Design a protein around this ligand. Structure first.
Ligand SMILES: [Ca+2]
Ligand SMILES: [Ca+2]
Ligand SMILES: [Ca+2]
Ligand SMILES: [Ca+2]
Ligand SMILES: [Ca+2]
Ligand SMILES: [Ca+2]
Ligand SMILES: [Ca+2]
Ligand SMILES: [Ca+2]
Ligand SMILES: [Ca+2]
Ligand SMILES: [Ca+2]
Ligand SMILES: [Ca+2]
Ligand SMILES: [Ca+2]
Ligand SMILES: [Ca+2]
Ligand SMILES: [Ca+2]
Ligand SMILES: [Ca+2]
Lengths: 289, 281, 281, 166, 289
């Protein structure tokens, strides 16, 4: 305020009478003397402004040297790192409290916001409010849950997907307002048991989720006025017809796995199938208006 | 930089045949990389020197808060607008304290040299919450050894050492886990105690809780607390009246208002006036 | 700085009526605080701009060592003179490694991306001592997944996992607490074993311990180790001879020198020659 | 004391930190001030302070290790030799054989004695007291009390023992 | 070596032909362009040296901005801090390994040497070799002892005064080469016991050592050819005569406390007495040749 404003009010005053120059001449030089620019279009011609040019080079050079749509990921874990790797190409904001993490998050194609996902001021700082969804994995299930309540107190209908570390608190996470709860040690622990005899379960689950498999696992919805509305799941012979396996069909926020042969396709239904990309089309078409 | 300025004004006096006001006036424009140009190396004897003087020249009242806790953070939030100095030993804290409108003094409130460093001596009061009651107490004795009558308000962590804090010279001892612990018990059945205590203290409640003093020669001196019908008269509830460094809560109907008495009442701000006036000379 | 240079060459083209080579040539002398002076603000329209462009302008083969331990520090001390790259994860270590004549690569030898970062792929050999035998082993598998035939020499901390280190792909496993632990036992009675082992390995001893190979078509091929009287002949003691990736210590008198054989002997440097010559084609 | 350092064949010391190792040493000296003390050094920097404190023999496994590391870049044999002579499995054992008073070999030349040929036992060095000469010159003169340091089959460690007696 | 030497070999080359100037003209300007000095006595007059003055302002300004007698105390403890407070006025070098300590040591009137008193290279770094004495208090008696052996391996006769933390290792410190071993918890622990009944012992010991007491505790030596040589300690009535109390007399590297009445004052003897400073003179004189 009045630091480099006192040496600029002292350098334009001692260059007005000490070198007989205008107010636009004393000031225009003081900015070239303190900025060590020194065009030269106004040098000390009188030893009265030369002892002043030396004093406005100390109090002047010193005072001018030091007076001069998206997806929010809360937490930075291997899980949420593995997720960021699959959102490459979308606007992602990682909010976490360790600063060092910043490099990894940047290199991993997402924006870093240093903050504490349980503090709301920081949720805000990452525009939780209005984001496609918020994905939460904090170090401890309590912190994860705390962060969730924070978000709810903001966009109280934003989509919240969270990871549960203990099974014991799967529901408290949902209670706190998590929309979808993923529990990787449960999934893992089970595939472990299952993989004692033969590997295929652990093989299927891990592979459908990896891009390399030709077969991709997709949700295809049943659009209003569908060639298939009220139609039987069996009457529709979808597998044969389109090749796409129907593993289940999502009526809302539930999913019926392997629906009975007599299932009736309401529109708005979500179809969950694995199949070659060529035949995910066939199903999309054999389904339209 | 006084050896390169004594070397640059010496090799610009004989090597370029200039005055003492000419060699020095240029050396400050050569080392400062300003370079007006009103004195450039015209002789290759001052040009090999202008290169050497470009390397060796260019290269060449208030309130003190001891401790920073959530309590003392919650206090700083209510002194916004007064000169406060927070003295604590963790440096990182400095940002939060600054953003919170108070001045930071990095130091160790138990070390006196640092109490000094924050002008404990002559401050309205010193407020102490250190991490451990022993440290709190230590800090207190420190202050006493300086302004031995400054007002000292301190927070006690254990109940067990409420008096040792007062012993050490704390004037007022606040114990938030006791207050909390009790409101807990009391809030089992119904919330109102905890509600009252927390709300009177929060600004939002229209009713504010104030101390009004009985000035010398008061329309109310020697007057009965009952004879004065203060509630009815002014609306201000009288919850207690402070005769000195004690406070009588809900004084008997026959209480006699000496002047200098402190009246402790809750009431709308409009009627805190009514009480102020109905009380004056 | 490309917006202030596009703003300073634009407000010095119309505000001082100069070319594009004139507005730009001055903006680089104004922002760089050089200020030759060959283009100063002559119009107060480019003088209020020279002040604004003074603020926004002035303001605007080798060997990889995985792990850094006293062992691998004692090794770097003996490779002084070769291209060495130390890869370790503590940054502070960087000074010691640099002063010790090797290049530092900050990284985590178990992470492959960092093995890469130090060009494990194609290095004379990789030497591994990580803090824990598991990490050591992990680092080894990393390397194999890259140059799967690079030479890997690793130090084992427990004996129990000497083979797991070899299993993981360590070519040569050195176990200094075993060597030490044994010399301990052996040095109870007399010092000489511990003396021998430590001294042959230290430069100061005139006698150096060298491997001399038996070149194809050797004056000594098919020749008996005894028939060759190598000690007497050359002075060089034959302590063992390495037939491939094994070493026979104190070969029987009737050992038959195939070429490609490695001779392991101690002897004065003058007579390491004598052996080299008495051995050639 | 509680472990009878006082009068023990030798005391062997490896404490967690070289300072503690050294301290332990001085303790022992303050008791049996001539008991044999063999100690391990963690830094090289304090090899001598350990000896200073009274360690008779100082073993430094990270130096031995660190060197074999360097040496094993090119070929494994040094590291192989050192580790194997020390392990029982190798038929060849590395032994010290002393030259008893009135030895068939006293004043005899190390070369004149053709010990290798004669007995098969390699002479890697000979310990004249508390020093060891490695690969002694051909003209070494076997005083009695000398310690012979050699590798060789157990059968021929005898041959050397006998070819050496009174 | 060849970084800012390639832009100075490039700026004196493109200012020789591009502005037709000498070798002393291209170089003399390049040092004023890269140093952002800019006298102006050689500005780009040709647009061929103006596109070069812009290129020698980037590769030139960037490459010239980042390419541009005594007493040793080993250890910094409250003890050795309390000692430094009493050597104010002598050349002291504190060698310790925590850097932060540096400020306290400086403010306390001694020079700081950051190092590890057990590493010899650092003992060296503080000129242990040839210092009046070396004073050692390291954090742990083992480290203290280690540091001592280090010093011995250097000036093997320098005076070494060290503090012992345990009593158990008082002698190992002396063994390692400590000349004088001070054990403050022993001194303290004893005065504790002694101060149960009455304070005077703890009072005497602490006060004789503090300046404020008029009475100072001094060692006065018996110079060769002393008015007092062979003289009896009793025959000399030193107390009465001079007022100075004789608490003991140091025959070499031992000290006899309260010598028998029949003690015979050899010269070179050290007299240890308390007394007013006026009468420490009287004793000095009543003692000379
Ligand atoms: Ca997790
Ligand atoms: Ca299975
Ligand atoms: Ca299919
Ligand atoms: Ca507290
Ligand atoms: Ca209640
Ligand atoms: Ca009211
Ligand atoms: Ca190791
Ligand atoms: Ca032995
Ligand atoms: Ca030889
Ligand atoms: Ca050890
Ligand atoms: Ca080799
Ligand atoms: Ca043999
Ligand atoms: Ca101490
Ligand atoms: Ca007493
Ligand atoms: Ca006296």
């Amino acid at each position: 305020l009045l630091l480099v404003l006192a040496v600029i009010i002292y350098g334009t005053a001692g260059f007005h009478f000490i070198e007989g120059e205008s107010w636009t001449v004393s000031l225009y030089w003081t900015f070239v003397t303190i900025a060590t620019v020194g065009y030269g279009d106004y040098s000390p011609s009188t030893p009265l402004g030369m002892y002043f040019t030396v004093t406005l080079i100390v109090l002047g050079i010193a005072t001018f040297a030091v007076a001069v749509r998206h997806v929010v990921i809360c937490g930075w874990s291997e899980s949420t790192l593995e997720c960021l790797r699959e959102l490459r190409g979308s606007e992602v904001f990682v909010l976490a409290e360790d600063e060092n993490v910043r490099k990894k998050v940047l290199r991993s194609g997402a924006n870093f916001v240093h903050g504490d996902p349980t503090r709301v001021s920081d949720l805000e700082k990452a525009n939780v409010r209005g984001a496609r969804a918020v994905i939460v994995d904090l170090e401890s299930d309590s912190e994860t849950i705390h962060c969730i309540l924070g978000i709810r107190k903001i966009d109280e209908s934003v989509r919240i997907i969270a990871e549960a570390e203990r099974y014991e608190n799967i529901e408290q996470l949902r209670m706190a307002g998590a929309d979808q709860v993923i529990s990787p040690f449960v999934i893992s622990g089970r595939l472990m048991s299952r993989s004692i005899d033969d590997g295929y379960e652990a093989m299927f689950v891990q592979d459908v989720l990896a891009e390399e498999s030709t077969r991709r696992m997709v949700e295809v919805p049943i659009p209003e006025g569908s060639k298939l509305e009220g139609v039987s799941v069996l009457d529709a012979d979808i597998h044969d017809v389109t090749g796409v396996i129907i593993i289940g069909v999502g009526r809302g926020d539930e999913l019926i796995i392997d629906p009975p042969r007599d299932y009736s396709f309401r529109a708005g239904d979500i179809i969950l199938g694995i199949g070659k990309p060529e035949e995910i089309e066939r199903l999309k078409n054999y389904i339209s208006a």
